[PDB]
Amino acid sequence: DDKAFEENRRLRNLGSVEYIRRKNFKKFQKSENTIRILISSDPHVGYGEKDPVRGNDSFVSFNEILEIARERDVDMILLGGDIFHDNKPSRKALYQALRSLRLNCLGDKPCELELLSDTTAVCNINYLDPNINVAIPVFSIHGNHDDRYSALDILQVTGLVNYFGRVPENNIVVSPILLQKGFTKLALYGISNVRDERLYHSFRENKVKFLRPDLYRDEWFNLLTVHQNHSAHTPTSYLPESFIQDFYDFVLWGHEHECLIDGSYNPTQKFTVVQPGSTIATSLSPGETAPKHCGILNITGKDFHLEKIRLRTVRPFIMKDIILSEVSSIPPMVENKKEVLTYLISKVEEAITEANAQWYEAQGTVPVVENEKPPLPLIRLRVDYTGGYQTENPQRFSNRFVGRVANATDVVQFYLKK
Amino acid sequence: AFEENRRLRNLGSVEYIENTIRILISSDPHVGYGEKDPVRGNDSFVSFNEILEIARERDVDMILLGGDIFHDNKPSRKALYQALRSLRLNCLGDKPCELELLSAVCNINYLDPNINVAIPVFSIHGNHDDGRYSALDILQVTGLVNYFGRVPENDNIVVSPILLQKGFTKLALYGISNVRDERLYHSFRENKVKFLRPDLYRDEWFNLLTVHQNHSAHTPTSYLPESFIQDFYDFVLWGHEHECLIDGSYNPTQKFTVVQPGSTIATSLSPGETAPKHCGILNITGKDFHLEKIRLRTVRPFIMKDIILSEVSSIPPMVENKKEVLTYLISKVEEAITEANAQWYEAQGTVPVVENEKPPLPLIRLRVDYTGGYQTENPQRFSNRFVGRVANATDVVQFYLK
Ligand SMILES: [Mn+2]
Ligand SMILES: [Mn+2]
Ligand SMILES: [Mn+2]
Ligand SMILES: [Mn+2]
């Protein structure tokens, strides 16, 4: 294992790259060279649907992303998959998504993107359908949660989403969607989610083929969208950044929920990797705590600039790691229950006023009577009680904050280090 | 107390508040039904597509449906996909809708400046469609179907029309989506239904009511008596009932035509399902109306035959005759098939030759009176005999005693 990860770091450019042969480009009847793309991932529409506090988060936040896209006048929308939480989404979940897509993505706004090529008699690229007035085309790969008929196909068949980066085998051919706006040229690629190991082994077997545009060969901005583990504990259960062909200029990394919207430059492959994160916390994990963002990717020539946008509808999430053997006045190895609880309770209150502060920061507002109050926050304390410390039933502890936290059932987790 | 129903009349309350409209009518497509069936798995998608295809081909103004659009409350992803696909390929386009409305995501679809609706669909929900999101809501939100005639409470129903005009003719379209029959019945008995009629041109309106209810029952509270329906109606589209009675009937006391077009697919091996399926085109021109019946071509034929063994002359009675009844019944199944196949070629308007499409496996059912001395097989054993030849694996035969 330890050395298998080094085999991975050294190996690069796997599989094969081969080559292949205001303005309105939409066909609806009833600057100029900078492609504007809103990037997001993992909305998990439907997630927490049945929860009396959290039930509408997924729908409101998915709607936000499309709202921002329309408010900020972008040319298109690119998503890293996992649109829906459930493989067969509830009627409500499907409805809300379709509602948000219909109200935010259709209108008279000219689509300025010329489809040079995408490489059934349903119109495939939606804004090219003369019967549908598409303002802002949505493109998305499928995630592991979107796994014959996915709900993605349903979004596609209604004409509101462009499901792309289809993967039926595991010989994988990755051909681009070609878009021109002024002199700027976007070559767009996607690999929808494949079992991480099946994908790792396909690269090792050089069974991933990339098709590149022969025309304007060096003029294309190359964007790859993926839905894969970016790290793992097994060395074959994720996708090594170095495997990805270095002709790519930009990589949108879905599947990972943590918001690392700033991007990392891969100095070897010389491309930037953006992991925008989910639009909702799907577990009380450390990775979900980082404030959720979407982005606007502006592409001009083969240069790009990234604007991060703090999501305003996400429930604040604050998680604290506490090692009780690093806290006095907690006298260990004695009946210290009242002392442990007091500390932990004070930490919850602390986290809470942190969450409210974080929320108001996202809104650009202040706690005053004429402004909207923050929603109940998610709060989790992870507590290592090694060294001689008394605990409390976690639900009993959680009930000390009813009406004060969104998760009034598991605010606290007690564990021992291993 | 049935007699009481025939006596009662005009229940609930009425409150006031080219030149021919062409409507394709149908009902109970049950998209999704028999999905998992290796023979019949595609029937419901193919036939539901037929309905819209015809509409498009025959260039109607609109489509009207009487519920049970989907067989399952939560349709499979396949079912919803095919409905949406058919709806989008068949109802969208450059043809203007010449229907002026006189009544955002819950508005009339062809009015939406972002979707070009060539042929608008209107539909109520049936009991197979009925939480508070229905699959009808999904079709509505995509802008592909106009869900109407919603029933928010069963104990106080306000029925309001959609108002449409083409040239000089005015259509008042009413729907009552499915309610448990007993609930609906009572609501009529307590005057808990309220019918809203337009103040202006109150009598220029061709009044059309769409329903999804039992048209007959075994108890007198589990169906919707024709009499209760306000006599200001000129036409009633009768959904829910699967049997094709496309020619309709005239209620002389209420003065309205009832049309029960039937389902577009057979969901039981009931006698009612055997009648050949049609859709229709209602040609409204001012006050009168011309209904054109249209034979469906994608529906699997279904032939049912009733047999009394004691009346079968080639079988000897009160004897070990098992060999002789099977031979007869097997010839009866063979005879039904040939009737099925001819029925299918009639629909296509073709003959059986090698250049032409040949018929699908038909549904075949024999109900067999074996009273007197006669010898049966296990029904299942009998139906296994016809794997290559009939579409139904089960219930090919039913023996009963008089
Ligand atoms: Mn995810
Ligand atoms: Mn995932
Ligand atoms: Mn039905
Ligand atoms: Mn029904």
UniProtKB/Swiss-Prot annotation, chain B:
Main localization is nucleus
Kindly state which keywords UniProt assigns to this record, in alphabetical order: Chromosome, DNA damage, DNA repair, Endonuclease, Exonuclease, Hydrolase, Manganese, Meiosis, Metal-binding, Nuclease, Nucleus, Telomere
Q: Which GO terms describe its molecular function?
A: DNA end binding; double-stranded DNA 3'-5' DNA exonuclease activity; manganese ion binding; nuclease activity; single-stranded DNA 3'-5' DNA exonuclease activity; single-stranded DNA endodeoxyribonuclease activity; Y-form DNA binding
Catalytic residues, per the record, are 128
Q: What is its EC number?
A: 3.1.-.-
Needed co-factor(s)? Mn(2+)
Describe the subunit structure.
Answer: Forms a multisubunit endonuclease complex, MRN, together with nbn and rad50.
**Function of the protein:** Core component of the MRN complex, which plays a central role in double-strand break (DSB) repair, DNA recombination, maintenance of telomere integrity and meiosis. The MRN complex is involved in the repair of DNA double-strand breaks (DSBs) via homologous recombination (HR), an error-free mechanism which primarily occurs during S and G2 phases. The complex (1) mediates the end resection of damaged DNA, which generates proper single-stranded DNA, a key initial steps in HR, and is (2) required for the recruitment of other repair factors and efficient activation of ATM and ATR upon DNA damage.
Q: Which family does the entry's similarity section mention?
A: Belongs to the MRE11/RAD32 family.
Q: What is this protein called?
A: Double-strand break repair protein rad32
This chain is encoded by the gene named rad32
In terms of the parent sequence, the fragment covers 15 to 412 of 649
